[PDB]
Write a protein that holds these residues in place. Structure first.
Motif, PDB file in Angstrom:
ATOM      1  N   UNK C  76     -12.830 -39.857  32.042  1.00 28.05           N
ATOM      2  CA  UNK C  76     -12.109 -40.628  31.004  1.00 28.05           C
ATOM      3  C   UNK C  76     -13.112 -41.314  30.066  1.00 28.05           C
ATOM      4  N   UNK C  78     -14.370 -42.169  26.826  1.00 25.51           N
ATOM      5  CA  UNK C  78     -13.975 -42.289  25.402  1.00 25.51           C
ATOM      6  C   UNK C  78     -15.155 -41.839  24.538  1.00 25.51           C
ATOM      7  N   UNK C  99      -7.622 -41.782  17.233  1.00 24.20           N
ATOM      8  CA  UNK C  99      -8.151 -43.174  17.289  1.00 24.20           C
ATOM      9  C   UNK C  99      -7.506 -43.925  18.461  1.00 24.20           C
ATOM     10  N   UNK C 100      -6.418 -43.436  19.067  1.00 23.48           N
ATOM     11  CA  UNK C 100      -5.753 -44.163  20.171  1.00 23.48           C
ATOM     12  C   UNK C 100      -6.479 -43.856  21.485  1.00 23.48           C
ATOM     13  N   UNK C 101      -6.905 -42.617  21.668  1.00 19.72           N
ATOM     14  CA  UNK C 101      -7.779 -42.242  22.817  1.00 19.72           C
ATOM     15  C   UNK C 101      -8.217 -40.799  22.646  1.00 19.72           C
ATOM     16  N   UNK C 119      -3.595 -41.546  26.228  1.00 25.64           N
ATOM     17  CA  UNK C 119      -2.859 -42.609  25.499  1.00 25.64           C
ATOM     18  C   UNK C 119      -2.258 -42.044  24.220  1.00 25.64           C
ATOM     19  N   UNK C 154       4.093 -48.588  25.908  1.00 24.70           N
ATOM     20  CA  UNK C 154       2.735 -48.964  26.352  1.00 24.70           C
ATOM     21  C   UNK C 154       1.964 -49.241  25.070  1.00 24.70           C
ATOM     22  N   UNK C 155       1.428 -50.462  24.865  1.00 20.24           N
ATOM     23  CA  UNK C 155       0.733 -50.795  23.630  1.00 20.24           C
ATOM     24  C   UNK C 155      -0.452 -49.875  23.300  1.00 20.24           C
ATOM     25  N   UNK C 156      -0.660 -49.641  22.002  1.00 12.33           N
ATOM     26  CA  UNK C 156      -1.808 -48.877  21.463  1.00 12.33           C
ATOM     27  C   UNK C 156      -1.814 -47.488  22.114  1.00 12.33           C
ATOM     28  N   UNK C 157      -0.683 -46.812  22.037  1.00 12.71           N
ATOM     29  CA  UNK C 157      -0.547 -45.376  22.345  1.00 12.71           C
ATOM     30  C   UNK C 157      -0.062 -44.653  21.087  1.00 12.71           C
TER      31      UNK C 157
END
Ligand code: HEC
Ligand code: HEC
Ligand code: HEC
Ligand code: HEC
Ligand code: HEC
Ligand code: HEC
Ligand code: HEC
Ligand code: HEC
Ligand code: HEC
Ligand code: HEC
Ligand code: HEC
Ligand code: HEC
Ligand code: HEC
Ligand SMILES: [Ca+2]
Ligand SMILES: [Ca+2]
Ligand SMILES: [Ca+2]
Lengths: 495, 495, 495
Positions: C76, C78, C99-101, C119, C154-157
């Motif tokens: 995982x 990034x 940009x989210x993941x 994400x 789920x925030x920032x997905x």
């Protein structure tokens, strides 16, 4: 003749009688007792706060605490470097003393010398005798450091050092510091830090976590006791609306907290917490908060999702951001508040099981290592001891995967904070309304609180991966909302 | 028949008679001697500059120089990457040819091929024959490289290459280059670099540091001799108002400097210094400084705290910064000037004790390795040989702690330089006075001089940790002062 | 009784008779055959797509595919972190779901679970059962993941997931997906992705590369077949104006491509290519391109130097850059298009020789490992097997030198793209002409296409070092030209 002593020292009798230390003569740890008996209470015995006395009967704990190890990657690791734990530190903490120097932690035996020598402490006044070649020396503070004196200058230093700082680096002032550093002891919060440092010969004492009288697991840290007393049913260490802490108040002067059972979460929370131990500013009136104020020796015992409300409630912030003028909270090493309610905490695992694992000394007597361990460097004893099915690579993979995912969000939160700060500056130069700049300041406050907690905290999410994700994505969300309203306000000006 | 030769070559007699090389026949190193005797001085003997001749009797020095090693992290490491030695290179050196390519150094045997092949040398004209799979080949330049020719183009290259560059990559032009590259030899400073490169078959010769005639420790580098001659009492190599160097001037054409005792600080300073070997600009009039000017083959032998005054004194700067137009000094690898006056220098330790440690060859004859060593990769021989109480981890910890603290200040100096440059651009667009922009240019000059020295220097402070701290904090101070006055001037415009 | 079956299934007879699988009874892989015979064609046999059936006779390929390994640096990873493969990702892809993941790839057995859990896929709806401690679990998708349901947030997905995504993570829909995902099968391009994911129990099947009927090397990926069919003489896999692929069209419903000889470049290009599998925008009219459009399941099979023209030709771009509004191409993992025409490709080496090297199982039977290998982690089998003169350090040095030089240019291309974007924003605020901003958008398009290809591609140039240099220097050139014209236009405004 302990019964003579016990006549006027009743609390010591309570702790010591029928304890594991019962047999130890008072003279082993206290000198001048005859003069104290013969001349009366005016002549105090000498109580030398000293690991070596504990070491005489506990050699493996003493030896492991003082053992010198050399990490081949070195120490004095500045966090504000590109590959560092806090790469955008200089921009995001602009206007805070941490911009002068903030390095990763190293071993406990170095904690006094590193506090006194850091570029942010006292203008570079304290330095290693003989410089770098002695940077690994352990033992007595003033065998290791020299005092360049009050008039010496060292470029690009700061003067953040204050007496309350010392309360998380040594047990040496246990009898010389009234509760909370209120006035009455040899030293208090208002003392000149350069008088205080002369008194600090040792790092954290054996007595920080262990009662000398009965060997009971305990805390001595005034701010930690005060926090537990303020919120005895709902604090992070509580269970069943109760905390395992009996507070003993000696003479209305100094408190200890004694626990029936080892709780290293409390023992380590004496220092591994967020704290306020510094002057700051009130949010309401903009008035200074000085060392006269109890808020300058304060443990919130709140996590990332609670601290912004907490510091708003007690009307306190640490610094205005040098660009945005946001009323920012400065966060420090909130390991206990992070660890609280995590998978391992809920499982009844405590800090000591990963960080003070079981090793064998000497012959082969089993003990808890008191050289605190970086688990990634010791996964067989820190992890596999309990996770028996784990290979070393599996343990490392689990630590580093969590750190990897958490750091991805930390770096993204920094990108967005940097964008917020740069956009704010542009919004200012485009003459965007001070009303709308004030809205953006609030978003910076929020984004900052939900980010800086995690660069301050030392696990990069390992201690609480869910809380880290919720916090850091909350930071990103706040920064994006600030950038949106600033960029919207910038269109509206020239509309 | 050497006495025949010695009749018209008196200096060679002085060096060779009663030396360790006394017995070696002239014919071993010089061909066409009979024609030179028989036909007279018009027909010069052939002097092939060649390590293999030295190797015939010094096999371990020759073998260790040419030994091929493969660093598993690779080579051609660009310095201007985020995790690199100079992460803000592209912004801070904007307008300099180093922005096209600047990689970390590798082994001595590669020094010609890497100078000729780098993207900044000659528009990509010279390339490895067979490309990457031959990037580790050593030996003769034109066995390793090919010439794509003068008309070939390679995108995003530069044309920094000039004849004086070659003086720090080979001994091949020792008899073909008049002192300082003034006119009169086969090559001079004004020569077409593409004629010069054809003549360079070998990297630094054995003769660079060792007299072929008597085996005396020596230097042959014209700029280094010229610097020592200009300041013979106070230069960095001096002791007791004297330097251990006897200059021998052959025919008013070429100088060597011979030393009674090995001083590898001088031998290595033939290349491991700051230098000017390039055109530049005068500060006073803005006039070009061309290869006609002696300032284009120049060794300051000054440290970080002296170079800005030094280049102001000789009315020279390298480039205007592409944004600020600051009259910047370009710094290169000042290892000798850094090392001067450091703890190890003061102890009488020289470059060779850490970088050419004692190893055993062959059977087991002891020699100085001529494959220069990166001490962190060889701490047993580079460090523990002298620091006998050090463990390998202790040696590594000491190197990396100093590098860690120094890099923290280097990265912080870059942050502030980047802030200075960005603020300058904002100040320009806010129409801040050219008077005040000129003040900021001076602060950029100062901040740049006190920063770039250390990315150019290869030790990240190890060679002189005190000087590095004083310089880099001075850089930060200068940048902060520039940012303050620019931000003040920006308020005053709209006031 | 296969002849009964073969009566109405003629293509299967062609593949299976006289093959290495000749003897295998139909019942081994198909259930309900009697009902299909007895009740007729209305009742379809069950075809369970399942590696374990192949594993019964091919245990080493099956075991090596499912083997669990733990990289001690974790997973995982990034890409958008400072030390990461794409450090300026958040700025350069601003306005894109990546940009989210966007993490580095890991092992094949994880490909479904990682697509569903990322994400950016489906708002965080799919998560690992039991969280991080099960992140290394392999096998069946819905044994490993849980569905938090459609209403959970789920925030920032992001919500990038769509059915066509699944075509590069599993063979499970081979009989349930009409060619290109046109309507007619159980699933098509317009299906709700949350219906599709329920059907995906396994990662890439054995049948992805190997015919079950005759064991012929093959491809099943619809977009790859379609690309080869569109350009059968000049595509990257062709030789002699011909491609080694016989397309078999079953019922006008689904195609396979069978090859006479193993070509892992084609087998791996079923997923390791640039693709379009997403909605986008037409360049001409600004109209949406929806899943109704065949351009949403598309393989260009073009390299870095061709893709910008290619996506202009088919009137498609992925996103407007959030700052510049440049009509950008989103690039993904173009390993096959990079590898095409490289030194190793020209030598007849295929992906499998480096990434599926020969190892011995069990007793000691030789096989191709189906746990695909990261060659730097396995240079003895990935490199030295063929380069017999290479030491492990030489192999590592060769990989890392190329990556080093390529990354130097990648980081420099990012620096210049960041400069282009920042200058554009300044040019906008200085009211530079929309005509001239449009010129800069074109330069951003070009610089972006020539950069992002290489962060998307996974080798950091190893697969084609010449193409990487030509592309990345082209990116730098385009960005510098954009920055020049913007900075020129900014002078001309206030002139
Ligand atoms: C009552 C008559 C006493 C007897 C008998 C003993 N001690 Fe005592 N002790 C007493 C008083 C009133 C005080 C201090 C009052 C104040 O607040 O200053 C003390 C102090 C100590 C201390 C000092 C703690 C500190 O502040 O540093 C120590 C360590 C101590 N006393 C130990 C001690 C021992 C070991 C005794 C038997 C030999 C003993 N005390 C007898 C009162 C009386
Ligand atoms: C205040 C007196 C402390 C208590 C109680 C504990 N820790 Fe600590 N710790 C403290 C400091 C000031 C430092 C840094 C010292 C320096 O000179 O930099 C640390 C360091 C650690 C580390 C890092 C160890 C290393 O890198 O070698 C760990 C893992 C650590 N501390 C953990 C820890 C635990 C688990 C505690 C309870 C048993 C604990 N600490 C107590 C300050 C204090
Ligand atoms: C307990 C609540 C603390 C107070 C009050 C202060 N410090 Fe601290 N310090 C503490 C811990 C647990 C650690 C290790 C963990 C970490 O994140 O560092 C530290 C570490 C330091 C260090 C070393 C690391 C560094 O920042 O360079 C220094 C130099 C240090 N602490 C200084 C310091 C000063 C000057 C304080 C008063 C302003 C101070 N500390 C208070 C725990 C606590
Ligand atoms: C095992 C389940 C752990 C428990 C319980 C606690 N910690 Fe921890 N900690 C752990 C890991 C895997 C890491 C990451 C870095 C590493 O070394 O592997 C950490 C990190 C720290 C640090 C930073 C220093 C370090 O060890 O590298 C500190 C200072 C630290 N942890 C302190 C700490 C405290 C006070 C705990 C109880 C509240 C705590 N840790 C619990 C693993 C585990
Ligand atoms: C005087 C009659 C000479 C005798 C006898 C020898 N040499 Fe000579 N040598 C002489 C002159 C006048 C010159 C060159 C004048 C000029 O500047 O061009 C030379 C030159 C050499 C060189 C060349 C150096 C160079 O520029 O490349 C070499 C290597 C040399 N000489 C060697 C040499 C030897 C080995 C002799 C005995 C066999 C010998 N010389 C005799 C003058 C005279
Ligand atoms: C190899 C070990 C050598 C032997 C034996 C001799 N010479 Fe030499 N010489 C050699 C080199 C590599 C060079 C180039 C310059 C340098 O200092 O390294 C030379 C140069 C000369 C010169 C030219 C000096 C000048 O006028 O500029 C002469 C005249 C010369 N060498 C003469 C000479 C004589 C007479 C020898 C036998 C007694 C002799 N050399 C031996 C290498 C070697
Ligand atoms: C000019 C002729 C040189 C002299 C004299 C010395 N060095 Fe050097 N060095 C030089 C160059 C041009 C290079 C880079 C070569 C390349 O192709 O990149 C270097 C490299 C080194 C290194 C790095 C070695 C490696 O990474 O493997 C070291 C440690 C080094 N140089 C040290 C050194 C010392 C101690 C010297 C005196 C004995 C010395 N160098 C001489 C150029 C020149
Ligand atoms: C002696 C005073 C030198 C002059 C004149 C030049 N170079 Fe150099 N170079 C020198 C040293 C000691 C080293 C190794 C140390 C270092 O910091 O690199 C180098 C290295 C190079 C390299 C390799 C590293 C790199 O920058 O990519 C190249 C490509 C190189 N040098 C080229 C070069 C050019 C083109 C010069 C004239 C403009 C030049 N060098 C002059 C010592 C000296
Ligand atoms: C031991 C006390 C040293 C002396 C004397 C000198 N150098 Fe050094 N150097 C040293 C260290 C520990 C390092 C850091 C990097 C490392 O490899 O450990 C360096 C670095 C260099 C470099 C960069 C290449 C490298 O070795 O990694 C060069 C080119 C270099 N040093 C040259 C050099 C010169 C010319 C010296 C005398 C003036 C010098 N070094 C002295 C250790 C020591
Ligand atoms: C003609 C009378 C048939 C005989 C005899 C067998 N099969 Fe068949 N099969 C037939 C038809 C017309 C169809 C499907 C028509 C449609 O498009 O729906 C089938 C289908 C299958 C499938 C299903 C493929 C899918 O879409 O999932 C399988 C796996 C299959 N048939 C296998 C099979 C075997 C093993 C037979 C002998 C026992 C057999 N079929 C006989 C027509 C006829
Ligand atoms: C689509 C069905 C695929 C085919 C066919 C191939 N690969 Fe692949 N690969 C794919 C994905 C979706 C992933 C990431 C999985 C995840 O969960 O992250 C990968 C990964 C690799 C890797 C990295 C392996 C690792 O890090 O352990 C390599 C080296 C790799 N893939 C190579 C590869 C080769 C050589 C193929 C043909 C034999 C091949 N892949 C087929 C998707 C698909
Ligand atoms: C074949 C042409 C593909 C399509 C269509 C999609 N993906 Fe993919 N994916 C593919 C490969 C070969 C790899 C491994 C190489 C790499 O660069 O990652 C992947 C990897 C992923 C991953 C893991 C890595 C990451 O990006 O975090 C995820 C999460 C993933 N893929 C998701 C994904 C989604 C959501 C898609 C539709 C929008 C999608 N992929 C399409 C091959 C192909
Ligand atoms: C040997 C000559 C190779 C051939 C043929 C192919 N690949 Fe490769 N690949 C190679 C190296 C040295 C690297 C660098 C990273 C490493 O691990 O060493 C790569 C990288 C990849 C990756 C990234 C994952 C990884 O292995 O680290 C993928 C997904 C990958 N390569 C796929 C791939 C495909 C599909 C190939 C044929 C088109 C291909 N590779 C050929 C070495 C070689
Ligand atoms: Ca705080
Ligand atoms: Ca210079
Ligand atoms: Ca694409």
């Amino acid at each position: 003749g302990r019964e003579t002593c016990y006549a006027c020292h009743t609390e010591v009798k309570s702790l010591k009688e029928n304890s594991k230390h019962a047999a130890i003569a008072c003279t082993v740890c206290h000198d001048k007792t005859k003069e104290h008996l013969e001349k009366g209470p005016d002549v105090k015995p000498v109580t030398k706060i000293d690991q070596a006395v504990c070491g005489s009967c506990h050699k493996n704990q003493y030896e492991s605490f003082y053992a010198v190890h050399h990490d081949p990657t070195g120490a004095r690791k500045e966090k504000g470097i590109p590959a560092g734990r806090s790469p955008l530190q200089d921009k995001l903490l602009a206007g805070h003393g941490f911009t002068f120097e903030h390095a990763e932690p190293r071993g406990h035996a170095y904690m006094v010398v590193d506090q006194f020598a850091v570029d942010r402490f006292q203008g570079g006044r304290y330095q290693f005798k003989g410089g770098w070649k002695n940077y690994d020396k352990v033992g007595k503070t003033w065998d290791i450091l020299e005092d360049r004196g009050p008039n010496a200058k060292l470029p690009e230093t700061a003067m953040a050092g204050n007496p309350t700082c010392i309360q998380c680096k040594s047990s040496d002032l246990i009898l010389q510091w009234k509760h909370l550093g209120e006035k009455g002891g040899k030293f208090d919060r208002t003392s000149n830090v350069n008088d205080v440092v002369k008194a600090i010969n040792n790092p954290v004492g054996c007595i920080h976590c262990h009662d000398p009288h009965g060997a009971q697991p305990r805390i001595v840290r005034d701010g930690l006791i005060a926090a537990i007393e303020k919120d005895p049913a709902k604090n992070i260490f509580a269970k069943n609306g109760k905390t395992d802490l009996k507070v003993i108040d000696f003479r209305g002067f100094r408190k200890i907290g004694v626990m029936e059972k080892t709780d290293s979460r409390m023992m380590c929370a004496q220092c591994h917490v967020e704290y306020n131990c510094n002057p700051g500013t009130q949010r309401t009136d903009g008035k200074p908060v000085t060392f006269a104020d109890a808020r300058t020796n304060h443990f919130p015992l709140k996590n990332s999702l609670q601290l912004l409300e907490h510091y708003r409630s007690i009307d306190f912030f640490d610094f205005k951001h040098a660009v945005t003028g946001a009323k920012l909270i400065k966060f420090q090493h909130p390991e206990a508040e992070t660890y609280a309610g995590s998978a391992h905490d809920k499982a009844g695992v405590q800090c000591h099981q990963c960080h003070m694992p079981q090793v064998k000394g000497k012959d082969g007597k089993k003990y808890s290592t008191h050289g605190v361990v970086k688990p990634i460097q010791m996964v067989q004893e820190s992890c596999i001891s309990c996770h028996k099915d784990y290979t070393p690579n599996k343990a490392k993979f689990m630590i580093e995967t969590i750190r990897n995912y958490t750091k991805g969000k930390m770096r993204k939160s920094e990108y967005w904070l940097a964008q917020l700060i740069d956009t704010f500056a542009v919004a200012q130069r485009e003459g965007v309304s001070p009303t709308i700049l004030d809205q953006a300041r609030l978003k910076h406050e929020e984004a900052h609180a939900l980010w800086e907690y995690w660069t301050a905290e030392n696990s990069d999410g390992f201690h609480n991966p869910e809380q880290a994700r919720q916090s850091l994505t909350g930071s990103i969300s706040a920064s994006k909302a600030g950038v949106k309203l600033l960029n919207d306000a910038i269109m509206a000006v020239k509309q």
